[PDB]
Design a protein around this ligand. Structure first.
Ligand SMILES: [K+]
Ligand SMILES: [Mg+2]
Ligand SMILES: [Mg+2]
Ligand SMILES: [Mg+2]
Ligand SMILES: [Mg+2]
Ligand SMILES: [Mg+2]
Ligand SMILES: [Mg+2]
Ligand SMILES: [Mg+2]
Ligand SMILES: [Mg+2]
Ligand SMILES: [Mg+2]
Ligand SMILES: [Mg+2]
Ligand SMILES: [Mg+2]
Ligand SMILES: [Mg+2]
Ligand SMILES: [Mg+2]
Ligand SMILES: [Mg+2]
Ligand SMILES: [Mg+2]
Ligand SMILES: [Mg+2]
Ligand SMILES: [Mg+2]
Ligand SMILES: [Mg+2]
Ligand SMILES: [Mg+2]
Ligand SMILES: [Mg+2]
Ligand SMILES: [Mg+2]
Ligand SMILES: [Mg+2]
Ligand SMILES: [Mg+2]
Ligand SMILES: [Mg+2]
Ligand SMILES: [Mg+2]
Ligand SMILES: [Mg+2]
Ligand SMILES: [Mg+2]
Ligand SMILES: [Zn+2]
Lengths: 98, 60, 80, 206, 127, 155, 118, 24
RNA sequence: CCGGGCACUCUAACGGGACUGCCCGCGAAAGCGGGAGGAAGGAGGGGACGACGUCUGGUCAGCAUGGCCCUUACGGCCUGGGCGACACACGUGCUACAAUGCCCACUACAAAGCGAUGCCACCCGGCAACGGGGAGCUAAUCGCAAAAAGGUGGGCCCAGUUCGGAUUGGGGUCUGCAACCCGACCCCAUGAAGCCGGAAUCGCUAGUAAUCGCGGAUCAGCCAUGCCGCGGUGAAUACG
């Protein structure tokens, strides 16, 4: 019963970190319930191409935020041994709650 | 983007309504996105240069 | 079909000035750049020079002028 | 009115962001301004060393600034005091108190920013522009570099009329997403005007 | 016992469950004619059964959500077709010429900049 | 259509009579994309056809459409610098299209209050050989064959 | 019948009929027929003499009506003009008063279109 | 139509609420 | 809703899948026509992407920048006015001119987004704008929220009107130091032109046109009927 909310801009990085957490918790904890997709938050930005009038191009971009919901059950006292300091990813934020 | 207008940054704008937002990079006044703090032109430039994490070209 | 709010706003620039004039008499033309201020009854009888952007027009205030702004009697634009 | 930026066109595949960190909506602009100031002060001091890229990564009040320079001996200084002064200015500008890393660039003639900088220096020294572009493209192609292209903007040779010298050879498939084309841009500030130098270097297919 | 079909049309799903019964249909707890009957094309959702002329051999329990009720009707058609095919594969040769098992891939085309609705160019006069 | 031949669209059959012509008439009645409203109009018009005529409304509908179909029309042609009204035959698809369009347009010209009554009365009058649509057919077949002298400009 | 002036609506719903009173719209007609306890669906020719007297007694003196209403609006505009107000100037020139543009339409305040040379 | 302040479609078009378009 | 479980729907990562592979006809071939199978074919549909160059095209007013010019003012601060001026002309749009409509009541389905000096369920006051109180929500779990056309019932009965809401009078709300010039919104009253538009002219080949509503960026507020997106219903026609 520990809420884990991962958030990031790269899906490969979040997925790799989630699989790392799952493999580090399987050997030391109980049957992990795996990650949940937690649908993406997309924020778009439409910006005129040219610095002057040229109104009908607009070349819009997007920024997506992906989330993960590992949510390990049975927070065994042996699980945090392989956890809480073992991480490759950099551009990934982690949320932990009880 | 006149230099004197870069006085926009002001702890004492004398009023809340007078406080507007400018582009921190080029000093623009219009089309200033609040999320990035830049204008639209600097947004496009720094997005092309890859200096904005997670910003990608949209297509659907 | 106009209104502002409860607690009518009047610029305290000339608010103290008109009552200071009433405290001693009926002094002549007063010059005010605050055309946003609302007319109050204690101004009736005086003559306020309202700045219309270029000059000061000698707006004399009567009884039936209470409630309006000074700019309503100081036109800013010239036409024909 | 065409030819969008290739680096931004490939930020998804075969090109990664220089700044790679997550930040909320209430903090994205501040960290972005901070990274912009970092790159600004970095490109003003390390130009003599030939820096090609400045990668910025953030986890929690710690920034792993990795500067890719063709000549690390300049950024290191005597015994390592230059990097000490640079980290001092870094901690003075940003109160984050972070570290710094240096990466040597093997064969700087394969990084388009440094190629464009070399061409811009040659243009600023009053060198033959056509020969400069030809020699630069030749130096790039003669070491790997399955494709190369260098473009110089108007006022070539200080002329009154603006021109554009092409001088390219190899393969530059700009419309190919998997092209992996390194792109660089430099400026030449002359007594008569401003010269824009663009450099495309094509390497790898998948 | 029970045969399932999914179906989909214009961003709408309709879980179709076929259980042999009288021939009455339930949709989201409501009757087939209390959701419909105000939509003329509703009968089309029962066209697969008429394709095999059963019309009384299968009660239907359908759970529909997504798009509008017309796309919902067509998704119900496709779901009934899929469940009826799962019942007996020999029905495919009877349902393929009618195309009831064909997925309708017509989707609302995305709106584009410079135009009004994804294709409507803004009117110009040139004078 | 320049490159291809622009093959004709195949309409879904009617939900009542199973006729694609009925569906095409529905579509010609349709307005702003309101299919259910046009279906209401036409099916209530069919309910008006009965209790006014012992015949099934499908037969009356088909016979009216057949009575509206024009045999020859007249198209313009620029020859020698001038513009002439050349008569020429009509393909069956254009016959059906013009028939349905004329039926709808002539029905909405009627003084009847609601749309179902208009469509029903127009269908009946066209089935018995009168109304605005038959007048349009007669005017077209008058203009055509009134300029027989241009028959050699057929093309 | 004759209610709240010399005006007589006839042969339609009583609320729609009262809409033909100058000081009365649909809201005031609904309010009057609601406080007077009169079915708004009935026609005018289907009204009881007592119901007409009731509606008359209420509407005649509960709001300001045709004569006094037009006189009061004219007096308001005349007062705006006599005080030299900006709105009085706009009424004086036959121009929009409520802050609309004049380089273009807002023709409904300027009357017909007096095209000139150019 | 959509331009009458005192109608349902008027409030919906202008995106407001009032006497002629309550919030249940 | 609880127990309960990942079958289905959905969610987001990966992968499969279509290549004229197969069949018939034609053809030197490429390929074309048709068919089978298939969710889909003959570029499946839509984006992103737009060559050497042209227009001495546009912008030194986003920025950079050569030269020239101003430096007790061509720089700088502030108050107010102005950019909203109206005899007129044009472009782009919005709303309409109604019965395939309008209005009232009840009722049923969507996608994409936004949300902590924020979104505000809900309760009370108020005709209402809104105010007071106050739950939840770092948000697939709470809120914006109602989707609208639609359906069902009822009213209107062809009249400038229960069409259409311009204009104006009066009374208010909210943002904001401050709504005179010059805000939006609410309520009462007012009720304009307008009966489908001359010469001329525009968009669109399928989920397109048409029509219906929803969100967002900038923004304290807003003149947004704009712009960028989202889904609902859904045509006509192409001889050439
Ligand atoms: K040029
Ligand atoms: Mg384009
Ligand atoms: Mg400047
Ligand atoms: Mg502001
Ligand atoms: Mg008050
Ligand atoms: Mg659409
Ligand atoms: Mg006709
Ligand atoms: Mg009246
Ligand atoms: Mg109305
Ligand atoms: Mg599963
Ligand atoms: Mg499955
Ligand atoms: Mg391509
Ligand atoms: Mg020029
Ligand atoms: Mg010019
Ligand atoms: Mg302007
Ligand atoms: Mg104005
Ligand atoms: Mg004039
Ligand atoms: Mg004159
Ligand atoms: Mg013009
Ligand atoms: Mg209440
Ligand atoms: Mg849930
Ligand atoms: Mg009815
Ligand atoms: Mg009326
Ligand atoms: Mg008239
Ligand atoms: Mg009429
Ligand atoms: Mg096309
Ligand atoms: Mg806003
Ligand atoms: Mg809007
Ligand atoms: Zn900028």
């Amino acid at each position: 019963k520990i809420r884990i909310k991962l958030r990031g801009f790269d899906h490969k990085t979040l997925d790799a970190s989630a699989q790392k957490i799952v493999e580090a918790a399987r050997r030391s904890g109980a049957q992990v319930s795996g990650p949940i997709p937690l649908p993406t938050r997309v924020r778009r930005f439409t910006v005129i191409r040219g610095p002057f009038k040229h109104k009908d191009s607009r070349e819009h971009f997007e920024l997506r935020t992906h989330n993960r919901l590992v949510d390990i059950i049975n927070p065994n006292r042996k699980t945090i041994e392989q956890l809480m300091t073992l991480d490759l990813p950099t551009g990934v934020e982690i949320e932990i709650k009880t | 983007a006149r230099k004197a207008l870069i006085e926009k940054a002001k702890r004492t704008p004398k009023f809340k309504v007078r406080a507007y937002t400018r582009c921190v990079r080029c000093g623009r006044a219009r089309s200033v996105y609040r999320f990035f703090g830049l204008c639209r032109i600097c947004l496009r430039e720094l997005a092309h240069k890859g200096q904005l994490p997670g910003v990608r070209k949209a297509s659907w | 079909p106009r209104s502002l709010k409860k607690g009518v706003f009047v610029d305290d620039h000339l608010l103290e000035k008109v009552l200071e004039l009433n405290a001693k008499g009926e002094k002549r033309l007063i010059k005010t750049w605050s055309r946003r201020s609302t007319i109050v009854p204690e101004m009736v009888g005086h003559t306020i020079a309202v700045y219309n952007g270029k000059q000061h027009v000698p707006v004399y205030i009567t009884e039936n002028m209470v409630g309006h702004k000074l700019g309503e009697f100081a036109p800013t634009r010239t036409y024909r | 009115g065409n030819k969008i930026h290739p680096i931004g066109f490939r930020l998804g595949i075969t090109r990664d962001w220089e700044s790679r960190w997550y930040a909320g909506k209430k903090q994205y602009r501040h960290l972005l301004l901070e990274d912009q100031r970092i790159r600004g002060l970095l490109e003003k001091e390390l130009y003599s060393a030939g820096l090609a890229r400045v990668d910025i990564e953030r986890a929690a009040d710690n920034v792993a600034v990795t500067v890719h320079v063709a000549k690390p001996g300049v950024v290191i200084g005597r015994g390592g005091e230059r990097i000490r002064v640079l980290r001092e200015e870094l901690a003075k500008l940003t109160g984050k108190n972070v570290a710094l890393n240096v990466q040597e660039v093997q064969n700087p003639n394969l990084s388009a920013p440094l190629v464009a900088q070399r061409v811009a220096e040659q243009i600023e020294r009053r060198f033959a522009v056509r020969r400069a572009i030809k020699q630069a493209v030749q130096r790039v192609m003669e070491s790997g570099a399955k494709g190369a292209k260098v473009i110089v903007s108007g006022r070539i040779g200080g002329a009154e009329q603006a021109r554009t010298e092409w001088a390219a050879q190899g393969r530059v498939p700009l419309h190919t997403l998997r092209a992996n084309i390194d792109y660089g841009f430099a400026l030449a500030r002359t007594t008569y005007g401003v010269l824009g130098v663009k450099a495309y270097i094509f390497l790898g297919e998948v | 016992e029970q045969y399932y079909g999914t179906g989909r049309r214009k961003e709408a799903v309709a879980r179709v469950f076929l259980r042999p019964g009288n021939g009455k249909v339930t949709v989201n707890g409501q009757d087939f004619n209390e959701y419909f009957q105000g939509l003329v094309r509703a009968v089309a959702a029962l066209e697969p059964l008429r394709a095999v002329d059963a019309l009384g051999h299968f009660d239907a329990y359908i759970t529909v959500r997504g798009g509008g009720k017309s796309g919902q009707i067509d998704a119900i058609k496709l779901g009934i077709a899929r469940a009826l095919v799962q019942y007996n594969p020999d029905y495919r040769a009877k349902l393929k010429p009618l195309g009831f098992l064909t997925r309708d891939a017509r989707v609302v085309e995305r709106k584009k900049y410079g135009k009004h609705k994804a294709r409507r160019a803004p009117q110009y006069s040139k004078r | 259509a320049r490159r291809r031949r622009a093959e004709v669209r195949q309409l879904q059959p009617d939900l009542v009579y199973g006729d694609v012509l009925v569906t095409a008439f529905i579509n010609k009645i349709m307005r702003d994309g309101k299919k259910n409203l046009a279906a209401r109009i036409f099916y209530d018009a069919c309910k008006i056809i009965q209790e006014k005529t012992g015949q099934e409304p499908l037969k009356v509908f088909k016979q009216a459409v057949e009575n509206v179909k024009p045999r020859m029309e007249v198209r313009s042609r620029r020859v020698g610098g001038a513009n002439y009204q050349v008569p020429m035959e009509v393909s069956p698809r254009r016959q059906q299209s013009l028939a349905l369009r004329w039926l709808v347009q002539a029905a909405n010209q009627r003084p009847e209050r609601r749309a179902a009554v208009r469509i029903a009365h127009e269908l009946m009058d066209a089935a018995e050989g009168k109304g605005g649509a038959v007048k349009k057919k007669e005017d077209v077949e008058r203009m055509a064959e009134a300029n027989r002298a241009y028959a050699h400009y057929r093309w | 019948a004759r209610i709240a002036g010399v005006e007589i609506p006839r042969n339609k719903r009583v609320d729609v009929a009262l809409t033909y009173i100058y000081g009365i719209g649909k809201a005031r007609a609904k309010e009057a027929l609601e406080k007077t306890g009169i079915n708004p669906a009935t026609r005018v020719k289907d009204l009881t003499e007592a119901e007409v007297v009731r509606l008359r007694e209420y509407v005649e003196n509960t709001w300001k009506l045709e004569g006094e209403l037009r006189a009061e609006v004219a007096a308001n505009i005349k007062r705006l003009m006599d005080i030299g107000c900006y709105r009085g100037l706009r009424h004086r020139r036959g121009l929009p008063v409520r802050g609309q543009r004049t380089r273009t339409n807002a023709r409904t305040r300027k009357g017909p279109r007096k095209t000139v040379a150019g | 139509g959509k331009g009458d302040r005192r109608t349902r479609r008027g409030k919906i078009w202008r995106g407001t609420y009032g006497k002629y378009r309550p919030r249940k």
